[PDB]
User: Fold this.
Amino acid sequence: MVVIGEKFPEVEVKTTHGVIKLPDYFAEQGKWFVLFSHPADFTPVSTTEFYAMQKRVDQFRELGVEPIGLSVDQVFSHIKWMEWIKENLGEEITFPVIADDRGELADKLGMIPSGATITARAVFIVDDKGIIRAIVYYPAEVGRDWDEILRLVKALKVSDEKGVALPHKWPNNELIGDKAIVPPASTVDEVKQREEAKAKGEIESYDWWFSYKKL
Amino acid sequence: MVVIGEKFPEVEVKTTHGVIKLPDYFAEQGKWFVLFSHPADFTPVSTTEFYAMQKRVDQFRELGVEPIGLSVDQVFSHIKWMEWIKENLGEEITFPVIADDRGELADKLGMIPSGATITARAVFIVDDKGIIRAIVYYPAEVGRDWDEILRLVKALKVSDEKGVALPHKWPNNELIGDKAIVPPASTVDEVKQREEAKAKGEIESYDWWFSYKKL
Amino acid sequence: MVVIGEKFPEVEVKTTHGVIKLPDYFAEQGKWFVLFSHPADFTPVSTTEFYAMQKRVDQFRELGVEPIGLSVDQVFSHIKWMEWIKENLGEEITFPVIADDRGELADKLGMIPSGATITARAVFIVDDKGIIRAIVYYPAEVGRDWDEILRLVKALKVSDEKGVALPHKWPNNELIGDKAIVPPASTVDEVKQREEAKAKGEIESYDWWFSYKKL
Amino acid sequence: MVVIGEKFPEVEVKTTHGVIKLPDYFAEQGKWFVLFSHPADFTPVSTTEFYAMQKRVDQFRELGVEPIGLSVDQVFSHIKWMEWIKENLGEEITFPVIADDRGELADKLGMIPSGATITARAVFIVDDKGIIRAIVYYPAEVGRDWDEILRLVKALKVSDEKGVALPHKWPNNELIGDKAIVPPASTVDEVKQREEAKAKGEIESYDWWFSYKKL
Amino acid sequence: MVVIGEKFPEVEVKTTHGVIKLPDYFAEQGKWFVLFSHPADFTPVSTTEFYAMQKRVDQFRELGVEPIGLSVDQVFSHIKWMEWIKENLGEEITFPVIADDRGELADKLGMIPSGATITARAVFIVDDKGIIRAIVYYPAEVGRDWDEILRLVKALKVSDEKGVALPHKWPNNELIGDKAIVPPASTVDEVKQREEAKAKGEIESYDWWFSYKKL
Amino acid sequence: MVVIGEKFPEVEVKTTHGVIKLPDYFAEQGKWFVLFSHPADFTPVSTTEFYAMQKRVDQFRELGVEPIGLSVDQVFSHIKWMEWIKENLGEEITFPVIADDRGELADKLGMIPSGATITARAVFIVDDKGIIRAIVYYPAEVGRDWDEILRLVKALKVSDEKGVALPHKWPNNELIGDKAIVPPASTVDEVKQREEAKAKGEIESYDWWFSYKKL
Assistant:
């Protein structure tokens, strides 16, 4: 078990691209990662999820975000199942995938549902400081929407680079579209600052605690 | 903390619509529920997420899913913040909100990030049996997309009703759009029973372990 | 729990004027403070109590006494509720207010009535040596009279500066008005002194143990 | 020690009017009581506070509130000190006084300041159920104003009788004089029920959470 | 609890002549003391006992013996009760009196009868080496005879200065008046000495173990 | 050890008049007793104190008080020492004497001075209930005055019989000679009942707390 804000546990993992250390192997290059588990090789929802992830991989990579899978299966199945996707949907898998033996890493991370020994569908966003920024736990029976995660990481990068909070559904927020939110003033002094920034056209606002601006 | 497939803890909560017991009050009625926490009242990303949720309340309610929020503030602030949404954005909020004192329920469900004392942005999908079906943990700095949750509850009701699994991004899957997946065969017998079904026109398939159908 | 004569527990607090350390932040400037709690933001007796306190703040400040509020609510509510007072009673709140998360400070100090998780109406007078000089615990259902406290601190300052005790209701004592009391002689020697001070017009007296004088 | 809303401990006390059991002796009769301690007999501030209390005894008694004092002296000194008040200030004292040996009751109620062995100046308001309704701890050097206590018992009887709360400084509140406050609404339903009541002329209000009325 | 021959416990005491240390304050000046307790101020047998002690104080002082009282009462009562004696029997009290709070010293010394919290009437003779030489415990209901104690201390001083034992009722012994007793011979050698002292007119004797002489 | 108002321990003692059980043997008959220890037989101060006691035996016996002595010697020495008193001073001793082996009873009653193994000179007054009424501890070097003990038992019988207290040096008190004191009033009611009694001629008084009368 884990929470948002913790550092990703240091671990060695056997993958399809060889043995690597987490978080370090991504963090040391300044890259983030999205860790996602699925129940098993040669299962149907997962195949749809992998194929969707490969079709999206460069969008993640472009952002300095590396996708990486996990199941409790051995590497030979991982590779045979990647080959099936390449041969039947004509999409080569180029992100690496963890052969988490005996759910060792799955367990440290809370990936295994009640009563099971296999993982469901989990997603961890780990930044390049190795900090877990967000977590998703979806059941076997429901496939993910990778676009939500792409949106999530994008919002996370922008939060970081510009010191802002993103609103519901950004960049299509109902009320303010792709404008970003200013952290609410938490003191009377910070309320003074907001008032000033507004009365000189630097932010818009519905109120002192609710300020926003174009990026 | 909690893991998927566990039971929602029995608990009385003070809400803006009175004291209720969870899961019971919803379960007793056969309603499911989506519990979401946010950090505090009169904060901005939250405001956008509440507005968006209210604009979606009936799309949940039509399904027999009730929304219900949470923050560590007191009910007097909840209602005044609700009234600010009504007066300034012209949406009355008609789902209840838990005033979780001292972060009590928050803690049991592990809603509190590393080093925090208030919640971030968690979602819990709880069915009519009181079973946790899926869990999301978003940080304060990124707002949620409620449309993925609607997608998700919708996928889950359909899985339960039709005995099926749902592909990546269903009902708009890249490979099979709004077709449902059949639980992979897991015995040699069940493979026999897929092959019968295919040549027989009852299901389409990519392989014995990848069979799907229109609903 | 605490008693008169103890030092105020050293604590960091998040307020509306930022994070400060108690007692130090007031003590280091030679200032005293009056710490007062109330149950919640956007509650009625408290609003009357805050408005009365702001209308009195300069009387406290003049004496080197800084008022400071507390409730278990987050700073965003504190500030939104101060704004309501400014807008509806035209009185800006200029004393700071503590967002005591999870009643942490409330508990150290015994502010939380039997069975509750929120504070009632408590008042601590802490001097500039950080010593608690007096304590009041009033229930939710009864509002304070700030004039009694103003009277109290004034009497306390004068006790300190002139080495005297003040009588019932000073400066309108029934029997001696705004005259102050001399500490009763506690030895036969100190009785000699009183006798002398009287038989040369320096104090008045009903008896050797009951001596008083104009200030 | 003790906190508001706890029950007065069952205890036999030797007083100047005999042995009685608290709270019972008052509670059995439906009388409330105000217990106040002072440091010692034949001390000056105390003398002024006793005189003042006697001059107020009937204003308490008319309400069904009985005054009763305490110090760690013995009953022989209490009565002689009482007689000094009668002979020198022309008030007989007609409330009883506890000779609390070895500071016993004093201790349970935490009447004893840091480093002291005798009491300072505490007041306890105890209703007819035996419940501590409010507590004051004044130091030896400052005498009390009994008029605030009369105000306070008076506010408390009225709260109990009329189901209401009382504002800052009631019956002379800066905003509503001697009007009583209605318990803020704490559910969306109760807000409905305030708005009905207002337009309907049953209560006046500043806001749904701030409603008041003439008694 | 204590016995004859023990050193008086080192203790600080608050008295009517100020705070002093026992035994030291008397011992360091070579003075003995008679410590006597009584139950309470403004009680009748005690008043008779104090008045008798003041009328005798110079007889004690002359011998280098300082009288000193104790009760569990505060110093203000001690002094007010001394004033009553001065005003109604015209005898100023000039020995000091201990305000033994909470029977602290009373208890170390066994002064408190079975079932009580107050002292009865006890007397300790402490010499200038701080040694307890004799102890009397009289009940509340019976007043002392100070002449017996005066006789006792006198006999004790003489025992010390001349190396002798005093007989029953000395200086009015039935058999030998104000003659003193020689310590009985405890060896055959010491019997030889007695025989010689007699057969040269230095002691009188009824027997070798029973020898006496004029002082 | 023991304190006043405790019960004499049940104990069988070998005496010069046989084996008896204390307190019973005296109590069973309604007789009180005065127990006195002395250091040893054939010692001088003791001899004088025995002679004096015998000369007083009937003055005790007339009152229903039986004298009874103690030392750590054996009964053969007691009787021979008794016979020395008869032959040399012409008084037969007619009270019994305890041969307390190994200082056993001596120890329970704390008769043994610091560093000693034999008794000094203790007196215990024990009533017919078996209650220790007063205790004296005189050292070996000073003999007792039996006349104070006669005074004392006499005061105690009278206290018990007439419900009163006895003043300093009664029956020859400096202020009221052989008048008895009335238990001070300890309630406001009992003060009323003193004042009635005085003006009414039933008691004389110096003050309400100092009332006395002829028997």
Q: What stands out?
A: Helices of chain D lie at 24-27, 44-54, 57-61, 75-89, 104-108, 146-161, 188-198.
